[PDB]
Amino acid sequence: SGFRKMAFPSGKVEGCMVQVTCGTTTLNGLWLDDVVYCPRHVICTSEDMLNPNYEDLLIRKSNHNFLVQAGNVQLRVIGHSMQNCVLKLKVDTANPKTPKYKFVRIQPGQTFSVLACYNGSPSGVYQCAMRPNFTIKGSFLNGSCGSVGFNIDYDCVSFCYMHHMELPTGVHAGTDLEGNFYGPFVDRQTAQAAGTDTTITVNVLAWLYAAVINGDRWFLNRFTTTLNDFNLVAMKYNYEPLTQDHVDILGPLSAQTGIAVLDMCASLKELLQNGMNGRTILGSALLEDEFTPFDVVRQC
Amino acid sequence: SGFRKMAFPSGKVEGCMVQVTCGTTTLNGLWLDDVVYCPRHVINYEDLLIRKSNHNFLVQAGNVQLRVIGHSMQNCVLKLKVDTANPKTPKYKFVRIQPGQTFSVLACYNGSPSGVYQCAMRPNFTIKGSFLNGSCGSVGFNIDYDCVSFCYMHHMELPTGVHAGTDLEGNFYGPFVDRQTAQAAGTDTTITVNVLAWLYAAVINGDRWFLNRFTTTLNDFNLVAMKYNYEPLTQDHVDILGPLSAQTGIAVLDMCASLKELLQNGMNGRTILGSALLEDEFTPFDVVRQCSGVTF
Ligand SMILES: C[C@](NC(=O)CN1CCN(C2CC2)C1=O)(C(=O)Nc1cncc2ccccc12)c1ccc(Cl)c(Cl)c1
């Protein structure tokens, strides 16, 4: 029993964190086999952050300009290349702690663990979700760039995020490990604003099923709804549309609890209409949207 | 910016998790140097233990079986002496924590780490964890520089879904026993110093709506705290909040008057750090550590 926001054990990722220094900038790198991955903005100076030409800046760099540090050992850079917004520093030593890994690009609503680092040293691990507006609501200070988001299924690390920047609202933007930004963001100091965020509806439903599995039933009702009527209501509360894919994904939780997805959708509509009335669901006074259907099944 | 419930990096603890099997029971063990620590309920515990032999305990570190060469009991923890010292043994200490103190839990099943989360030792000595069957022997810890302080070992789930366990010397937190009997968690209270630390974290993050021009005496605040099932705030707590008070410019008794107004009037549809409830599972140290980026 119990339901916590749970992160994956970070050990397999800790053994990959290195510090990358180029000129005055110091950030984190991910050392896998003989390559160190980090945000390409590590090559940027002061007057070339509004409109940096990364190809022009990288061509002027040599391997010895990049100082890579793994613990108290300095690694030797023997090559450098750029793949989208990520810089790949070829090093002369393969990381012996390299776990079984994959690079996966995730969709909005997906959750992952973040290992927050500073100067190549892990300082904390927390759980995140990719927001529908493609930002992540993280906890990062200056120096956290290069910190990564990941999931661990079986003994394999799926790296899904690399931190690149903080938007003016305090939310965070980054890329997958192939350097492709999540969302319409760019690694430029140009005026960028996160779009209006919405609640991840399928995740709220999964969390309502977790509450039912844990014995909380007060919010349930005798109503059901059509998928379209639910979406017309949910949209008015800035909730993401619920698709047939989402209804299908909730199938196992519906089968386990005996509550049809559209029946739980009608409980959700009622919660949106009434609020919680001084009650909590799984210790929360707000509807939680950072647990996916897969997280709920895994934790329960 | 941002404020998350953040656990310590679990790597140093993952390298210590082993699976202990004795008869039909399988749970987790903590392998440090040449000793495996686990709940004694894996086996009148002195009468039960005397009947066991080393070969009855199957210890597994990954796909390698460890051989037990001795066994002894220290309070509610069983200590299995093994032939091999754990090469991954970090710098560590066994520390007993106080209610209100926070720690990270590495939840394990069959000696395999599956999740990490941050929680607080409640004033009623339970932890509001997330554990299923097989999680016994999962440990709670903090990291100081490169030293792991082990503070908790999971033993059981109480009928309300809350958890109970011991320090690494086998002493329970709370008035609990490791036996099948009627046990109930006492009425819980809110960790007042932690709520204040979290209100300072909200101020550091730009959430200032709850601030007011008022201050209060420590006695008037404690009279209100008692009324709302909040733990008494001591001069020690006020002193610990000193750095956060200095950084934000809000005296502790000034933040107390904000807390008092929140308790008597509610949040009024408004939220603090994305929460509609007052969070009490961040200590003053946790807030400083997260709003300053201390590394391990
Ligand atoms: C590296 C970063 N540089 C800055 O923003 C630093 N700077 C720049 C403006 N300003 C001046 C000193 C007062 C700063 O503070 C960044 O946003 N990283 C940070 C990451 N996570 C959390 C942060 C929390 C506070 C601060 C910075 C954070 C950055 C900036 C613009 C771009 Cl286009 C990109 Cl790709 C990256």
Side-chain angles (χ1 to χ4, degrees):
Chain A
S1 314
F3 206 68
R4 278 276 176 183
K5 184 144 291 165
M6 202 179 281
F8 281 102
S10 61
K12 283 167 170 58
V13 179
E14 289 168 55
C16 303
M17 303 311 303
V18 300
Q19 185 192 60
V20 180
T21 298
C22 180
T24 185
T25 307
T26 290
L27 42 67
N28 309 281
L30 183 62
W31 181 26
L32 300 166
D33 305 304
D34 61 349
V35 179
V36 171
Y37 301 83
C38 74
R40 72 184 176 164
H41 70 73
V42 70
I43 73 186
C44 298
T45 74
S46 60
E47 12 70 89
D48 41 75
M49 201 60 228
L50 267 160
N51 286 288
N53 189 322
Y54 289 103
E55 300 97 77
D56 178 58
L57 296 167
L58 196 57
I59 212 73
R60 307 170 184 267
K61 295 265 166 182
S62 66
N63 299 329
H64 60 266
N65 292 146
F66 302 98
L67 312 176
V68 178
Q69 208 182 312
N72 270 90
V73 179
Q74 190 195 312
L75 301 179
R76 195 171 70 101
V77 177
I78 62 168
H80 62 274
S81 74
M82 188 169 59
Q83 177 175 15
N84 305 303
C85 304
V86 297
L87 173 65
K88 304 201 286 211
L89 301 177
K90 189 71 153 174
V91 291
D92 213 357
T93 307
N95 181 4
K97 304 186 196 168
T98 303
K100 278 188 196 194
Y101 77 93
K102 18 198 61 173
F103 289 169
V104 181
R105 181 173 178 87
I106 59 163
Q107 290 290 289
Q110 178 67 264
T111 60
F112 57 95
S113 304
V114 173
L115 181 64
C117 307
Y118 296 94
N119 300 302
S121 287
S123 68
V125 63
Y126 59 90
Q127 192 69 0
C128 250
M130 178 57 57
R131 300 310 307 176
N133 73 356
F134 290 99
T135 67
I136 74 156
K137 289 180 153 181
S139 177
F140 290 126
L141 306 169
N142 213 11
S144 54
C145 306
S147 291
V148 302
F150 64 97
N151 286 291
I152 307 193
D153 264 87
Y154 202 42
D155 65 327
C156 186
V157 184
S158 54
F159 292 103
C160 61
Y161 176 87
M162 174 167 275
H163 183 56
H164 281 68
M165 62 192 201
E166 184 167 289
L167 296 175
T169 56
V171 300
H172 305 104
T175 72
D176 55 29
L177 265 294
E178 295 172 304
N180 290 123
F181 259 94
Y182 282 106
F185 308 109
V186 296
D187 51 358
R188 279 168 67 202
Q189 201 77 247
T190 205
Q192 298 185 78
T196 64
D197 204 22
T198 55
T199 303
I200 310 157
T201 308
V202 63
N203 286 7
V204 175
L205 292 165
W207 174 82
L208 289 175
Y209 279 111
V212 172
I213 293 166
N214 264 71
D216 260 311
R217 291 182 55 102
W218 69 258
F219 53 85
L220 296 177
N221 66 33
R222 60 191 192 85
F223 302 112
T224 186
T225 183
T226 66
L227 185 48
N228 203 56
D229 284 348
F230 175 74
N231 286 329
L232 291 173
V233 173
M235 267 128 43
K236 301 173 191 182
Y237 292 97
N238 276 339
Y239 263 62
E240 276 295 298
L242 193 74
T243 68
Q244 187 54 231
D245 272 11
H246 295 148
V247 173
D248 292 348
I249 302 172
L250 290 167
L253 288 169
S254 165
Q256 185 188 341
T257 65
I259 307 177
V261 176
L262 294 170
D263 183 349
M264 193 68 88
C265 288
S267 295
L268 183 48
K269 282 157 67 183
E270 185 172 282
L271 284 166
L272 294 174
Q273 165 192 273
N274 297 348
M276 296 223 199
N277 182 28
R279 284 178 290 231
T280 62
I281 299 167
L282 288 174
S284 179
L286 289 188
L287 304 179
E288 296 292 320
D289 76 348
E290 302 212 339
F291 292 98
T292 70
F294 194 99
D295 287 348
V296 170
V297 169
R298 196 178 185 270
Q299 195 177 154
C300 310
Chain B
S1 315
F3 205 65
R4 279 278 181 197
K5 185 143 290 164
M6 204 181 281
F8 280 103
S10 59
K12 284 169 169 57
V13 179
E14 288 169 56
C16 302
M17 304 308 304
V18 300
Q19 182 202 74
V20 179
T21 299
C22 180
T24 187
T25 305
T26 291
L27 43 66
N28 309 281
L30 183 62
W31 182 26
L32 299 167
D33 306 303
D34 61 349
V35 179
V36 171
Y37 301 83
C38 75
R40 71 174 176 181
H41 70 73
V42 70
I43 73 186
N44 190 324
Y45 286 103
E46 167 250 328
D47 176 57
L48 296 168
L49 194 58
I50 216 72
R51 306 168 185 263
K52 295 266 166 182
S53 67
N54 299 329
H55 271 277
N56 291 146
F57 302 98
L58 312 176
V59 178
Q60 208 178 303
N63 270 90
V64 178
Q65 191 195 315
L66 301 180
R67 50 165 296 118
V68 176
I69 62 167
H71 61 274
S72 73
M73 190 170 289
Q74 179 175 15
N75 305 303
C76 305
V77 160
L78 173 65
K79 304 200 286 212
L80 302 176
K81 189 72 153 173
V82 292
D83 75 335
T84 309
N86 189 355
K88 305 188 193 167
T89 303
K91 276 189 70 201
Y92 77 92
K93 284 177 302 192
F94 288 168
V95 311
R96 183 173 176 88
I97 60 162
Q98 289 291 288
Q101 297 189 335
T102 59
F103 57 95
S104 303
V105 173
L106 180 64
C108 307
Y109 296 94
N110 300 305
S112 161
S114 70
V116 63
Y117 62 84
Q118 185 78 356
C119 68
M121 172 61 58
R122 301 308 308 175
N124 72 357
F125 291 99
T126 67
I127 78 174
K128 291 177 154 183
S130 175
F131 290 123
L132 305 170
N133 211 12
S135 65
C136 307
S138 291
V139 303
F141 64 97
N142 285 291
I143 299 177
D144 174 45
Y145 313 132
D146 66 326
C147 180
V148 183
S149 307
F150 292 104
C151 62
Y152 176 88
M153 175 166 276
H154 181 63
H155 280 67
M156 63 187 198
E157 183 170 290
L158 297 174
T160 55
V162 302
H163 303 98
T166 71
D167 56 28
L168 264 294
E169 294 170 41
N171 298 291
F172 258 96
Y173 284 101
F176 307 114
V177 312
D178 58 348
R179 160 187 45 178
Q180 183 52 56
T181 195
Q183 303 189 75
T187 66
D188 204 21
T189 56
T190 300
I191 313 153
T192 310
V193 63
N194 286 7
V195 174
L196 293 165
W198 174 82
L199 289 176
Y200 279 110
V203 171
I204 292 166
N205 267 270
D207 229 334
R208 292 180 63 101
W209 68 259
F210 53 85
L211 297 175
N212 67 33
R213 66 161 57 235
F214 304 111
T215 188
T216 181
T217 64
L218 187 53
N219 313 56
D220 284 348
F221 176 73
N222 285 328
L223 290 173
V224 171
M226 179 151 294
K227 179 190 171 178
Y228 289 88
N229 277 338
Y230 262 63
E231 279 294 300
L233 193 74
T234 69
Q235 185 57 61
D236 273 10
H237 294 150
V238 174
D239 293 348
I240 302 171
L241 290 167
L244 288 170
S245 165
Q247 184 188 341
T248 65
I250 310 267
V252 175
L253 294 170
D254 177 6
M255 192 68 89
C256 284
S258 275
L259 182 49
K260 177 203 304 179
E261 294 308 325
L262 295 170
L263 291 174
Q264 301 178 348
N265 297 274
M267 293 226 198
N268 307 353
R270 292 178 285 194
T271 61
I272 300 168
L273 288 172
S275 179
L277 290 183
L278 303 178
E279 179 69 47
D280 76 346
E281 302 210 345
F282 292 97
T283 69
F285 299 99
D286 289 349
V287 170
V288 170
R289 202 178 297 125
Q290 193 175 158
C291 312
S292 87
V294 170
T295 69
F296 310 99

Coordinates of all heavy atoms in Angstrom, one line a residue, chain A residues 41 49 140-142 144-145 163-166 172 186-189 192, chain B residues 1, ligand 1:
Chain A
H41 N 25.5 24.3 -26.4 CA 25.7 25.7 -26.0 C 27.0 25.8 -25.0 O 27.3 26.9 -24.7 CB 24.5 26.4 -25.4 CG 24.0 25.8 -24.1 ND1 24.7 26.1 -22.9 CD2 23.0 25.1 -23.8 CE1 24.0 25.5 -21.9 NE2 23.0 24.9 -22.4
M49 N 25.2 34.3 -27.9 CA 24.1 33.5 -27.3 C 22.7 33.9 -27.9 O 21.8 33.0 -27.9 CB 24.2 33.5 -25.8 CG 23.4 32.3 -25.1 SD 24.1 30.7 -25.5 CE 22.6 29.8 -25.9
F140 N 16.1 23.0 -11.2 CA 17.5 23.2 -11.7 C 18.0 24.6 -11.4 O 17.2 25.6 -11.4 CB 17.4 23.1 -13.2 CG 17.2 21.7 -13.8 CD1 16.1 21.5 -14.7 CD2 18.0 20.7 -13.5 CE1 16.0 20.3 -15.3 CE2 17.8 19.4 -14.1 CZ 16.8 19.3 -15.0
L141 N 19.3 24.7 -11.1 CA 19.9 26.0 -10.9 C 21.0 26.1 -12.0 O 21.1 25.2 -12.8 CB 20.6 26.0 -9.5 CG 19.8 25.7 -8.3 CD1 20.6 25.5 -7.1 CD2 18.8 26.8 -8.0
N142 N 21.8 27.2 -12.1 CA 22.8 27.4 -13.1 C 23.9 26.3 -12.9 O 24.1 25.9 -11.7 CB 23.4 28.8 -13.1 CG 23.9 29.1 -14.5 OD1 23.5 28.5 -15.5 ND2 24.6 30.2 -14.7
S144 N 23.3 23.1 -14.0 CA 22.6 21.9 -14.2 C 22.5 21.4 -15.6 O 22.1 20.3 -15.8 CB 21.2 22.0 -13.6 OG 20.5 23.1 -14.1
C145 N 22.9 22.2 -16.6 CA 22.8 21.9 -18.0 C 23.6 20.6 -18.3 O 24.7 20.4 -17.7 CB 23.3 23.0 -18.9 SG 22.4 24.5 -18.7
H163 N 19.0 18.3 -20.2 CA 18.6 19.7 -19.8 C 19.5 20.7 -20.6 O 20.7 20.6 -20.6 CB 18.7 19.9 -18.3 CG 18.3 21.2 -17.9 ND1 17.1 21.7 -18.2 CD2 19.0 22.1 -17.1 CE1 17.0 22.9 -17.7 NE2 18.2 23.2 -17.0
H164 N 18.8 21.7 -21.2 CA 19.5 22.8 -21.9 C 19.3 24.1 -21.4 O 20.2 25.0 -21.4 CB 19.2 22.8 -23.4 CG 19.8 21.8 -24.3 ND1 19.5 20.4 -24.1 CD2 20.7 21.9 -25.3 CE1 20.3 19.8 -25.0 NE2 21.0 20.6 -25.7
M165 N 18.0 24.5 -21.0 CA 17.7 25.8 -20.5 C 16.5 26.0 -19.6 O 15.6 25.2 -19.6 CB 17.6 26.7 -21.7 CG 16.5 26.3 -22.6 SD 16.5 27.2 -24.2 CE 14.9 27.0 -24.7
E166 N 16.5 27.2 -19.0 CA 15.3 27.5 -18.2 C 14.6 28.7 -18.9 O 15.2 29.7 -19.3 CB 15.7 28.0 -16.8 CG 14.5 28.3 -15.9 CD 14.8 28.5 -14.4 OE1 15.1 27.5 -13.8 OE2 14.7 29.6 -14.0
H172 N 11.5 24.3 -17.7 CA 12.7 23.9 -18.4 C 12.5 23.2 -19.7 O 11.5 22.6 -20.0 CB 13.5 22.9 -17.4 CG 13.8 23.6 -16.1 ND1 13.1 23.3 -15.0 CD2 14.6 24.6 -15.8 CE1 13.5 24.1 -14.0 NE2 14.4 24.9 -14.5
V186 N 14.5 26.6 -29.0 CA 15.8 26.7 -29.6 C 16.9 27.1 -28.6 O 16.6 27.8 -27.6 CB 15.8 27.7 -30.9 CG1 14.9 27.2 -32.0 CG2 15.5 29.1 -30.4
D187 N 18.1 26.7 -28.8 CA 19.2 27.0 -27.9 C 19.8 28.4 -28.3 O 20.9 28.4 -28.8 CB 20.2 25.9 -27.7 CG 20.8 25.3 -29.0 OD1 20.4 25.7 -30.1 OD2 21.6 24.4 -28.9
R188 N 19.0 29.4 -28.1 CA 19.2 30.8 -28.4 C 18.6 31.6 -27.3 O 17.5 31.3 -26.9 CB 18.6 31.3 -29.7 CG 19.3 30.9 -31.0 CD 18.4 31.1 -32.2 NE 18.1 32.5 -32.4 CZ 17.1 33.0 -33.1 NH1 16.2 32.1 -33.6 NH2 16.9 34.3 -33.3
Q189 N 19.2 32.7 -26.9 CA 18.7 33.7 -25.9 C 17.6 34.5 -26.4 O 17.2 35.5 -25.8 CB 19.8 34.6 -25.4 CG 19.6 35.3 -24.1 CD 19.8 34.3 -22.9 OE1 18.9 33.9 -22.2 NE2 21.1 33.9 -22.8
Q192 N 11.6 33.5 -25.9 CA 10.9 32.2 -26.0 C 10.0 32.1 -24.8 O 10.4 32.4 -23.7 CB 11.9 31.0 -26.0 CG 12.8 31.1 -27.2 CD 13.7 29.9 -27.2 OE1 13.2 28.8 -27.6 NE2 14.9 30.0 -26.7
Chain B
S1 N 15.4 27.5 -10.8 CA 14.0 27.5 -10.3 C 13.4 26.1 -10.3 O 13.9 25.2 -10.9 CB 13.1 28.5 -11.1 OG 13.7 29.7 -11.4
Ligands
LIG1 C1 22.7 28.1 -19.5 C2 21.5 29.1 -19.4 N1 22.1 30.3 -18.8 C3 21.4 31.2 -18.1 O1 20.2 31.4 -18.0 C4 22.3 32.0 -17.1 N2 22.1 33.5 -17.2 C5 21.9 34.1 -18.5 C6 21.1 35.4 -18.1 N3 21.4 35.5 -16.7 C7 22.2 36.6 -16.3 C8 23.3 36.5 -15.3 C9 22.1 37.2 -15.0 C10 21.6 34.2 -16.2 O2 21.3 33.8 -15.1 C11 20.3 28.6 -18.5 O3 19.2 29.0 -18.7 N4 20.6 27.7 -17.6 C12 20.0 27.2 -16.4 C13 19.5 25.9 -16.3 N5 18.6 25.5 -15.4 C14 18.2 26.4 -14.5 C15 18.6 27.7 -14.4 C16 18.3 28.6 -13.4 C17 18.8 29.8 -13.3 C18 19.7 30.3 -14.2 C19 20.1 29.5 -15.3 C20 19.6 28.2 -15.4 C21 21.0 29.4 -20.8 C22 20.5 30.6 -21.2 C23 20.0 30.9 -22.4 C24 20.0 29.9 -23.4 CL1 19.5 30.3 -25.0 C25 20.5 28.7 -23.1 CL2 20.5 27.4 -24.3 C26 21.0 28.4 -21.8

